[PDB]
Amino acid sequence: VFILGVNFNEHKLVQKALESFYGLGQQASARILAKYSIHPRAKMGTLPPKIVTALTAELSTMTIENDARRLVLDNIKRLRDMGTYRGRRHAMGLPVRGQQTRNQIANARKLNKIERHG
Amino acid sequence: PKDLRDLSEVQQRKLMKLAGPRYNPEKDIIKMSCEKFEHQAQNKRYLGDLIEKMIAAAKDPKDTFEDIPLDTRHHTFTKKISFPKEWLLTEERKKELEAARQQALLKDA
């Protein structure tokens, strides 16, 4: 089925589908299902076409999108523009939270950017 | 609390409530200490004056706290196990076993 323009398979859990959107986690997932009387173990192919449309209208009123990424990307961009310590660690791809840099800084070198994945 | 014979049943229970965690339901004793002062004589005097207030407050007919049930969550009650009295090999039980020992032989025979 389709929820907010994303296609999901029948054998997929409705909760795991909602939780696949950025910013939508366990708390929001449990409250969206409770709002429309969907048990956590509901599969995707069992939802009526009426409720599948209600979920799309529900997620459209939430901050679960690139919109949520902008909030995170803006916080990082601000740290750099101000000229703070943390901001300069994102730009150089270095650990930002006081980790030791002599060894084991792989994930920092790979993910720490100004334009992070999210 | 039962040593204070000048108190009534309702008043003795009210005293157990004011004591709070100082009351031991299993032994029925109110143990309370004091080391607030520099000299041991002063700690004894305080407890003496304090026990007089506990009794005066218990006699106060303003609020008997009968609505409040006695709270014993501060105490951890212990359950003791004892040897079963039905297993004691007495002259009466010996006859009981002889019957069971003999019925077993018949059932198999």
Binding site: - | E38, G48, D49, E52
Partner: protein, 134 residues
């Protein structure tokens, strides 16, 4: 305790108190070589029952005067008393004063001792200095 008529029970062997320290045998680097140390405290318990309060204090006074070196002692004394402790301790003042008439000679100070200052604060601070901090 027998001569004083005190029925004593024990000595009850209480559990041993064992401290442990593992230290390197060398002050400098060498760390793969350590050794264990300990300090085991051996202790006993003598409990007296149906003992008169005063008689129990003569027993304790006797043990302290003839204490054996290398032994530490601690006593917990019990005693039954009536209600009205405040008044009881005020009436016994005259009784204790008579017993001290001949004992005041131990202390002596210049008229209006000024080195003491605040009496209560002197005891509180002088007691800490005697005990080494607390």
């Amino acid at each position: 305790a027998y001569y004083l008529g005190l029925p004593a029970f024990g000595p009850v062997p209480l559990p041993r108190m064992i401290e442990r320290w593992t230290v390197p045998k060398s002050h400098f680097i060498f760390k793969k070589s350590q050794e264990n140390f300990e300090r085991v405290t051996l202790r006993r318990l003598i409990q007296i029952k149906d003992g008169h309060p005063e008689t129990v204090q003569l027993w304790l006074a006797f043990l302290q005067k003839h204490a054996y070196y290398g032994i530490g002692m601690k006593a917990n004394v019990w005693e039954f008393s009536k209600l009205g402790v405040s008044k009881a301790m005020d009436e016994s003042k005259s009784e204790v004063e008579k017993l001290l008439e001949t004992r005041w000679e131990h202390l002596s100070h210049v008229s209006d001792m000024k080195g003491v200052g605040n009496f209560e604060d002197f005891l509180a601070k002088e007691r800490l200095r005697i005990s080494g901090g607390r």
